[PDB]
Amino acid sequence: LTVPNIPLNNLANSRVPAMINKMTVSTDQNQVVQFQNGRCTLEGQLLGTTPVSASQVARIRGKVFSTASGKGLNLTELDGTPYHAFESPAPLGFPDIGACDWHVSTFKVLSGDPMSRLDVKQNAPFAPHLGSIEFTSDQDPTGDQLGTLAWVSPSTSGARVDPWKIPSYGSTVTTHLAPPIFPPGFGEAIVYFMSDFPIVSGAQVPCTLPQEFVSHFVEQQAPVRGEAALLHYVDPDTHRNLGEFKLYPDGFITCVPNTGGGPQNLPTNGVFVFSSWVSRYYQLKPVG
Amino acid sequence: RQLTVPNIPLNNLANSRVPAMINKMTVSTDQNQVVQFQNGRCTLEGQLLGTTPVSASQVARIRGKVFSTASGKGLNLTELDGTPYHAFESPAPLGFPDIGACDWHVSTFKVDGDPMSRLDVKQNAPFAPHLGSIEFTSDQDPTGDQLGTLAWVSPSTSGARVDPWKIPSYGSTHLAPPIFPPGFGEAIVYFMSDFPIVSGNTAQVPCTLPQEFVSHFVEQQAPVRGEAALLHYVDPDTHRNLGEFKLYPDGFITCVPNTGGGPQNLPTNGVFVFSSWVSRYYQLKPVG
Ligand SMILES: CC(=O)N[C@@H]1[C@@H](O[C@@H]2O[C@@H](C)[C@@H](O)[C@@H](O)[C@@H]2O)[C@H](O[C@@H]2O[C@H](CO)[C@H](O)[C@H](O)[C@H]2O[C@@H]2O[C@@H](C)[C@@H](O)[C@@H](O)[C@@H]2O)[C@@H](CO)O[C@H]1O
Numbered sequence: 001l002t003v004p005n006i007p008l009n010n011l012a013n014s015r016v017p018a019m020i021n022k023m024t025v026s027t028d029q030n031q032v033v034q035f036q037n038g039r040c041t042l043e044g045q046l047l048g049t050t051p052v053s054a055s056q057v058a059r060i061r062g063k064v065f066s067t068a069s070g071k072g073l074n075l076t077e078l079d080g081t082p083y084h085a086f087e088s089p090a091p092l093g094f095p096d097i098g099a100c101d102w103h104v105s106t107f108k109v110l111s112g113d114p115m116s117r118l119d120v121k122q123n124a125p126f127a128p129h130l131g132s133i134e135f136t137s138d139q140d141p142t143g144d145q146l147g148t149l150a151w152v153s154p155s156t157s158g159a160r161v162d163p164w165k166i167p168s169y170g171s172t173v174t175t176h177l178a179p180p181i182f183p184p185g186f187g188e189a190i191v192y193f194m195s196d197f198p199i200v201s202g203a204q205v206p207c208t209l210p211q212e213f214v215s216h217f218v219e220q221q222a223p224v225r226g227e228a229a230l231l232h233y234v235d236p237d238t239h240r241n242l243g244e245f246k247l248y249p250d251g252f253i254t255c256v257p258n259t260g261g262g263p264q265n266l267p268t269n270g271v272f273v274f275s276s277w278v279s280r281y282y283q284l285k286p287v288g
Numbered sequence: 289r290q291l292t293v294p295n296i297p298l299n300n301l302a303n304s305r306v307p308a309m310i311n312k313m314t315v316s317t318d319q320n321q322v323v324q325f326q327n328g329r330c331t332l333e334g335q336l337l338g339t340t341p342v343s344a345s346q347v348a349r350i351r352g353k354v355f356s357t358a359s360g361k362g363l364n365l366t367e368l369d370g371t372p373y374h375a376f377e378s379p380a381p382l383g384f385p386d387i388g389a390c391d392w393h394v395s396t397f398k399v400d401g402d403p404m405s406r407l408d409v410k411q412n413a414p415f416a417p418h419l420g421s422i423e424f425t426s427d428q429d430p431t432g433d434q435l436g437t438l439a440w441v442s443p444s445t446s447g448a449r450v451d452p453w454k455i456p457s458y459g460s461t462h463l464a465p466p467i468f469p470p471g472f473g474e475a476i477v478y479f480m481s482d483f484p485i486v487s488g489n490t491a492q493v494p495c496t497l498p499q500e501f502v503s504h505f506v507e508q509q510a511p512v513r514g515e516a517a518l519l520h521y522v523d524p525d526t527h528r529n530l531g532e533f534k535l536y537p538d539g540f541i542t543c544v545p546n547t548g549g550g551p552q553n554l555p556t557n558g559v560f561v562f563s564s565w566v567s568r569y570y571q572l573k574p575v576g
Pocket residue numbers: 101103119153154155156157158159200201401402
């Protein structure tokens with residue numbers, strides 16, 4: 001097993017098309033998350049809707065159709081091949097920012113302004129597992145539309161956006177949803193990789209694996225040889241070890257954050273390096 | 289360390305010049321055509337060239353601070369992480385788009401209602417990214433620190449077309465050097481993505497390395513042990529070799545296309561695999 005030899009600020013978020021700005025631990029360190037993107041086992045098994053490339057993250061493709069009140073999209077995979085409602089929660093790469101309006105910028109797969117902004121609510125017609133969503137738009141999109149999540153806003157007036165939530169993929173879900181990630185306790189806290197992103201009335205989107213970690217694991221198909229992988233976070237200029245982290249086989253990273261601090265207090269240009277396989281209860285030196 | 293290429297099928301690789309997925313390979317209609325792309329450029333030893341960034345989510349992005357001039361508005365460019373851009377030995381900030389001789393339309397948000405601004409950028413006199421600024425017009429009112437992504441392109445003037453095979457005039461701008469087809473019947477392999485090119489001959493953008501190849505080389509920091517690396521393009525299900533390719537130290541890929549054909553006739557679900565180091569003069573079996 002190796003992990004990407006790339007500084008953290010050159011790594012992409014796995015839940016929005018953005019670069020990682022910093023690490024942090026959650027304010028409540030017992031908080032459970034269930035992100036559907038950025039999910040991959042160390043052996044290279046993709047989970048949820050997680051795609052391989054950073055340029056598949058939080059994108060939507062589909063064909064415009066007429067609904068009772070206006071338009072909708074009959075979803076396809078991002079490469080234009082048919083989506084089928086099967087085991088995945090949604091087409092691969094489908095956004096997983098829950099409980100908010102989405103604003104998705106698409107183009108028809110030209111003359112004049114080729115872009116349409118699809119304004120999508122997560123209400124009853126939001127059925128991505130089934131393969132359809134509805135939208136309103138100030139433009140007039142038709143046919144095969146491909147696009148990217150541009151920004152998010154509250155579902156109802158005066159409310160707030162919580163990007164730590166995931167969507168409900170619909171009533172047909174019974175489905176390979178990626179499972180919740182539980183803090184393993186004993187002082188350990190899940191490490192979240194944060195990105196600037198336009199969240200209106202939120203300002204940063206968390207994910208649990210940088211996207212290049214996901215493609216690294218998929219590519220490598222490495223055997224898991226211990227209960228956790230001990231990583232060092234290294235200053236790439238001085239080559240000094242800045243802190244210890246554990247990478248778990250189910251595909252998330254923890255640290256023991258110093259009280260009143262944590263990995264948010266580390267420089268954001270360090271490189272993760274695999275050090276050794278360790279047992280499940282290997283005790284980390286606190287960080288930050 | 290031993291050179292490898294990503295164990296990822298073609299259709300899961302990102303374009304290195306626009307934020308998009310690769311959907312096919314091809315050769316240029318003039319097989320003697322020389323290109324000088326500034327993104328997607330990296331040596332096999334992991335040396336980035338031109339404006340090439342590491343992550344697919346840095347590709348064709350722009351960041352800067354809005355300022356007002358005597359006659360309009362401009363962007364004082366920074367690197368994508370907000371740190372200062374200095375004119376030194378690069379054409380522009382890392383990741384800056386390299387689609388030449390056309391208008392750009394760049395969707396940005398304020399790193400801080402509708403949060404988006406579309407910056408409409410002409411490649412005329414005030415387009416001076418090497419020196420650290422460009423001018424724009426916008427129907428919105430962007431201020432302060434704006435970060436965004438190239439959304440679409442259109443012709444510079446009314447009668448014109450967009451040729452995405454061209455690069456900008458950035459100004460001595462320290463360009464990555466031209467790539468020549470290297471002889472022996474070989475043609476440069478171009479990796480194509482759908483993208484909203486308005487008034488292009490097609491709505492596709494070529495690049496010379498998939499973005500994940502770039503990050504792979506940067507990570508691996510592998511020694512070059514021969515004049516060219518022979519690759520096989522392999523079907524991942526049957527494991528059959530679908531064609532020979534050469535990967536050159538300067539960071540590009542060639543094949544010998546069959547007359548009237550080429551890699552555009554190959555399936556798009558194959559995986560490149562390193563075979564061996566070969567002589568510069570190694571004669572490839574024709575493909576497609
Ligand atoms: C002052 C007021 O009530 N203005 C509303 C808009 O609501 C304001 O801006 C929204 C983006 C939120 O920040 C909201 O908290 C704020 O009051 C309203 O925008 C819509 O707001 C709803 C939530 O109530 C959704 O977020 C919806 O997606 C928003 O519509 C988007 O943003 C709008 C500003 C427009 O750009 C739309 O085209 C977008 O789809 C608008 C529209 O209902 O009405 C104002 O009066």
